[PDB]
């Protein structure tokens, strides 16, 4: 499946998700897990 | 004062080039002049906000 | 004579004294509160 | 691409003419209004030649609507939109053409802009001339539409047993009757009418009406209920709109309320035709009556998906309006007879036409007995022809008209600056 | 920014590294640091409306770069108290220090999307109010058309 | 660190007379090279300065 | 805008386990009739360029 | 707590609704759109969830209900005083101490409001905070605000109603009658019905003073059978292009105005009576004036103070106080709660009219026929109480009212689940 | 100074007027919205006088309108706007008066003011009820309105050859026919009217109707076509409504589409009475019939010249409405009436009127047999008394109503602030 | 105070006494459960205002019913509790009384508590004889029970102008 296709890449490349899925939780280059600890504090200041 | 009426009036003499009651001295007769500097003291005052 | 003046006749408002101005403030926070003891709420870790 | 592109660009020019509304003689020199401050940004988000501030929004808009009906015209490009697999699913296509590459792109900020649609239906005073925008998404995605809009209940007519039509009825209720005949229920545009026709008195007492599963989602508000004998502004026969002061009062019921509804009262009244039959009491016998439902109407929370997915029709042949389409097509039009075009794009829309209803039936082939008795702007009656091919199965008639319906809007709103040259 | 890494060094990882079974959180967050381009660049960004915006038409329809340029400049100085060089932003790449138009072009193609923050947003409605009085005095200054 | 407690433009005080006047008042005394005239007309001339 | 204005901004964003410290808070609730100072705001940029 | 109080977050959340609309898919991506930043702006003076707007609003909602169903709480409101005057309410309710508290700024609101009413295109649907003020302090409406005369109806002396006037109007008169004066949506009819012809000459029908705050512009004046779409018996629309001219006339008008005519008119109905002047003698005829009908400036009052009410038992609107409702009403049924609500909003309702009548006990003979929600019904229903004095009873209307719109607004966003 | 100052000038006032609306009960304490800000920045732009948000922005409107008022009163001051010139060219005049040079002067921003209104046009949804702007700019510089801007039919009329009125019509449509009689073509708000009465049947077959010139410029979209006996809610004597389900179907065409438009269907339909005659093609023989076509009317692009213009206007005398100016002078006469000028202005107006028809005659004479029916506010009747005076010719009178609408309408918005008390 | 810390403190109360439920039989030495943790946090927090962790249960647990029983033993002390007030609102008193300070007062974490008691009715199979807590928030807030749960119908039962009884039918 493309992710990302070449077209909108500044490299050429499709961007599957076989490009993706090996590397770390196998999440989508596209959508990448965040680490989210500091989040609660953030949202509270107003902060992104 | 305006009669025995206290009141606190725009310092015009300050206001050099404005001083509408020196600019009022030009008019012809003796009386115009002094009624209208009359009118300057009861229009240019400090009034309460 | 009148014309004239009232041509030359607007007005203006100001503050008898002047407001206090001051700068800004260093925003500090200090801790407060007691904390107490909270445990692990998995338990204990599966060997190996 | 997606369709949710197609709709989210829609929007956009949608709110590109809405802040050009705005703006109209409210362009000063020493101040630059945020209205304009917002067309400003959306006109540069669209330009593609243009670096900052577009000197003149003209050209660029232009540019736009000759590359889109360019696209539009040809089955080779459009062709990807017209299969069932783009009006069901969010599926990214793989289709490079220069146009769906430099205007179609995603242009709503995810997730804000659903809560705020959200929030909406919820509101006050919502607009009672919607965009386009919210019908496709009615259309298309069967999404709510606001609690408070109000329509015109004609519009929401579709044919029941009893009845095959709603303006058709005019003609027969105009010509005294020979006996008793059954209940009617039509509907004008800004009043619900519904009695019993007879040569001879009716007695007094009750009578149970049902309500019909096209106005079985209305509701109305700061509504009037009395006798009346015209429908459209056409005299209805055999019906008397007499009484008395000494007449005993005449009173209905909803199973949606546990109060009686007075009737011939200055009272204005709040009922919903949701639930079931509504049972009026004739308080006096009357040699045929008509009851008369003046006021607001709206279509109840939730339910505005039987309208917009076209699941209020159960006959075959069947009345069906057009979702007000032909009211914004307008512009396009006028600009299409401005340049001859009109006749070559009608053309060209037979084809889309011909060619999508062809995706739409395995063996891939046009169905045998279709004709259009009219041009591809005159959507009503072209989606009555669609609805009425019983060599078809029903839902796909459905799906043919409803993804039809999304392709003319597109045209109705991308179309309008055209000026091929 | 680019290194190269050799994945056969995280053997001596699996074998060596002694985990320490706890986060030493010692440090603390400099949070904010790293502003300041993006803060020039957004200026720039919004100088350049609020410029073409009174002109009533893009500023490079009638004028030379050099010339926009110069009053995006000095204007954007004003509000840091910094000398500012737009040109510096705007190159192909780190390597060479030649402007490009291609650049500053695509950096115009994306208008503004937030509020100005506040500090700066005040300076500037303020101006714009003044330059809106300030206009209508036009008709009384001594210039006649013809 | 992330409030800011900064004043964008910090004004300062003026007095009346520190205005920028605007307006020229001339005083003139016409009358004429034709009739002879005694009332001649005060008149006050304002123009934009 | 008047310090008091000040403390209940910064004071209701301490986060969790924090308060404003007290000299602070003090010395910006107990400000007069007439006092300024600037508002506290909140410095975000647009990251994306 | 203040009455103003109310109005003002009233105000507010009307404000909130109205910003809602205007950003409704005009969110999009590379864009902060003015009105959004104000929707923004305006979510933020609510609760004392920046993220999602639906929340804090839900919240509100949820505790708005919570108090307009317990007398206890929302007792201060039922009070003859709240409604009389702007003096600050000693009461601790969490709700109001949260969200009701003074919202508008001031003296510059009013300002622009006057400013308003001499604007050129006012708001054709008005929101209710005109309203509420237009009842409460009876303060004016716009100058060129339309209105659809037949709400402003009001009972008389020889009509008792109009529409109930319809079907009467539509049986063949025994003899000549006595002349009507009826309202419609978009105009107003008027004339003297027979069975035999009527001669040629002058004809006066005096304005009854619920229509004597019209005015219309824009306005075609001819002669009809049709009242509401039903044909108007003993009457004749026959004319022939040789029939002698048919005016009338108006006093605050020194000329004559021409029926059956093709020319655009503009007149006020308020100087006492219509002087129409019968050219040709007519078989029993109805006047129509079909244009676009505005109360004519300061005597609003008279509607939104239920002052133009003379008689008893009288016919009134609701003051379109039931067009708001329907959203909330919505969200009642679809928690199901439509019952539960109709029965506390009862004890509110007759809580309240016990605070104003002395001694303290609900009257004798006060049946309701309908529910809490129709109010035009309830409203005449209160209005027909021969115990209680009658302006005592307007009171009660005007008051009940206010608080029916200020449901109308603020429960909205409900939901218990 | 010149018109165009006087529009630009115009649009400033109906604009600060637009931007007052959209604050009325959206100016709370925490919130400078942007509405506010640019109703802020254009009192500003009108009386230099009032800057900042401190002002009281009555005082400054109020001197403002006051001293309009004294001007356009006093015929020596006003006199230069009433003369030939001024309406039909932009030289700068050499007027000097207070007033004038105080408030009237360039205001719009040149040349995206232009472009911007041009891209209206082919907006969606234009302003439903527009500014007196628009009209200004339509009846004195013969611009062109938008495309999908509704229009009330009967507004259109004017008198031709046939009929010599359209709402007279109705006593006539009232009265039994003595025998067959020729066609008839009337306009109500919602709809058009056509159609033969006879007191005899007419037999089947295809009838022809020539559309009127006023009307031949009118478009419907969402538009229903039916048979009907009311008009204007009156009841259409010699017209049968009765029809059978078994009858044969009736259509008719329009010169512009090549397809046949159905009658007494659900269908919603398109189509322009541009171009041509109306071919009718009774199914069934009936006893005299009228067609009803219900919709939403409008302009062809760029026809509406005609109307605004007084191009359509053929006879001598005809029927003529005020291009809803009546609708806008509500504010300032109900000001007038307040301070008890009613009287004085209405002399003013008078001789305003005077002078201005004076100077559009050689010689320099009020015509004779010039007498006015109506007062200066009820536009409609005193356009049809200068459209009826049989001593100048047509054209010099069109220009008189034109030139003399354009000083009613910037009466309308300069002086609703008055007063002087 | 409020009624809502009352039924919060309960909440938990009844919380403790399930892990007390789910702890029994299941506490081996070396092994420390996941409930067993559970169960000990919430013992923390019961008296919070004394300690930061706690060693055995069984003495806090008592000196807080016994406590408890001396309460709503005088109307002098849990009066406050006894008003028309205290059923209908959420406004927090002030009761100077050493139980109320002590252990009456917010356990449950707002609003994500909620959140999941809504979530609940929508659950597959909920609890087939639920909490007390679930009871105390409908009798008293009116708030909905879920979905799936069973109930046995005789207890709905009231009584109709028809058959004044069920049992007596």
């Known amino acids: ?48 | 004062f305006v009669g025995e009426l206290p009141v606190k009036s725009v310092t015009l003499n300050k206001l050099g080039d404005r001083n509408m009651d020196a600019l009022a001295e030009h008019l012809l007769f003796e009386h115009d002049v002094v009624n209208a500097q009359r009118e300057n003291r009861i229009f240019y005052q400090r009034k309460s906000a | 004579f009148s014309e004239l003046r009232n041509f030359f006749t607007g007005d203006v408002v100001i503050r008898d004294d002047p407001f206090d101005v001051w700068d800004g403030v260093k925003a500090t926070y200090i801790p407060i509160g007691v904390h107490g003891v909270r445990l692990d709420p998995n338990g204990d870790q599966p060997p190996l | 691409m997606s369709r949710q592109m197609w709709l989210d660009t829609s929007a956009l020019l949608e709110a590109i003419s809405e802040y050009v509304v705005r703006c109209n003689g409210d362009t000063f020199s020493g101040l630059t209004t945020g209205d304009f401050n917002a067309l400003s940004n959306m006109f540069t988000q669209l330009s593609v030649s243009s670096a900052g501030y577009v000197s003149d929004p003209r050209v660029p808009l232009q540019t736009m609507s000759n590359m889109f009906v360019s696209f539009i015209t040809s089955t080779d490009r459009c062709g990807y939109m017209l299969r069932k697999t783009w009006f069901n699913s969010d599926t990214k296509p793989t289709v490079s053409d220069d146009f769906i590459t430099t205007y179609i792109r995603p242009r709503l900020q995810v997730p804000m802009s659903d809560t705020v649609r959200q929030l909406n239906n919820l509101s006050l005073q919502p607009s009672a001339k919607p965009k386009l925008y919210e019908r496709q998404n009615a259309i298309m995605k069967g999404l709510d539409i606001p609690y408070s809009e109000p329509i015109e209940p004609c519009k929401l007519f579709r044919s029941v047993a009893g009845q095959t039509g709603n303006i058709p009825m005019m003609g027969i209720l105009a010509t005294p009757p020979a006996a008793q005949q059954q209940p009617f229920f039509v509907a004008e545009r800004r009043r619900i009418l519904f009695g019993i026709r007879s040569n001879a008195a009716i007695p007094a007492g009750a009578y149970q009406f049902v309500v019909p599963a096209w106005a079985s989602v209305l509701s109305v508000t700061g509504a009037y209920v009395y006798f009346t004998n015209s429908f459209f502004g056409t005299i209805i026969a055999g019906v008397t709109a007499t009484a008395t002061a000494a007449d005993a009062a005449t009173t209905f019921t909803v199973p949606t309320d546990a109060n009686n509804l007075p009737v011939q009262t200055d009272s204005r009244l709040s009922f919903s035709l949701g639930g079931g039959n509504i049972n009026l009491e004739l308080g006096v016998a009357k040699t045929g009556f008509c009851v008369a439902i003046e006021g607001e109407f709206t279509i109840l929370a939730n339910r505005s998906q039987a309208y917009y997915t076209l699941n209020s029709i159960t006959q075959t042949p069947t009345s069906i309006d057009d979702f007000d389409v032909s009211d914004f097509l307008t512009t396009f039009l006028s600009q299409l007879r401005a340049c001859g075009q009109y006749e070559i794009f009608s053309d060209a829309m037979d084809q889309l036409t011909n060619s999508l209803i062809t995706n739409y039936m395995d063996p891939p082939a046009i169905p045998a007995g279709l004709a259009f008795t009219s041009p591809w702007f005159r959507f009503s009656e072209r989606a009555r022809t669609i609805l009425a091919l019983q060599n078809v199965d029903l839902n796909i008639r459905k799906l043919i008209v409803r993804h039809l319906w999304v392709i003319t809007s597109l045209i109705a709103v991308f179309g309008r600056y055209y000026r091929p040259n | 920014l680019h290194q190269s890494v050799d994945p056969q060094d995280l053997l001596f990882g699996v074998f060596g590294i002694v985990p320490q079974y706890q986060i030493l959180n010692e440090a603390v967050p400099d949070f904010f640091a790293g502003g300041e381009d993006i803060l020039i660049l957004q200026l720039i960004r919004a100088v350049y409306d609020t410029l073409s915006n009174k002109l009533g038409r893009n500023p490079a329809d009638i004028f030379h770069l050099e010339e926009v340029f110069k009053v995006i400049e000095e204007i954007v100085s004003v509000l840091v108290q910094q000398k500012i060089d737009v040109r510096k932003y705007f190159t192909e790449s780190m390597r060479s220090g030649s402007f490009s138009k291609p650049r500053w072009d695509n950096f115009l193609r994306r208008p503004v999307a937030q509020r100005l923050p506040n500090l700066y947003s005040v300076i500037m409605t303020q101006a714009d109010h003044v330059y809106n009085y300030m206009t209508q005095l036009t008709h009384i200054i001594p210039i006649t058309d013809c | 660190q992330s409030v800011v407690s900064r004043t964008p433009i910090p004004l300062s005080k003026i007095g009346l007379q520190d205005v920028k006047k605007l307006f020229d008042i001339n005083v003139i005394k016409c009358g004429s090279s034709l009739r002879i005239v005694d009332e001649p007309q005060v008149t006050f001339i304002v123009s934009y300065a | 805008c008047h310090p008091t204005v000040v403390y209940n901004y910064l004071s209701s964003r301490a986060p969790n386990f924090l308060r404003l410290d007290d000299q602070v808070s003090l010395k910006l609730t107990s400000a007069g009739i007439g006092t300024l100072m600037p508002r506290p705001v909140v410095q975000l940029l647009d990251y994306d360029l």
């Open chain 1, 1 to 48: 499946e493309i992710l990302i296709p070449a077209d909108q890449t500044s490299y050429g490349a499709n961007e599957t998700r076989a490009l993706s899925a090996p590397y770390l939780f196998g999440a989508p280059i596209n959508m990448l897990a965040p680490d989210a600890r500091l989040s609660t504090y953030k949202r509270d200041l107003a902060l992104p």
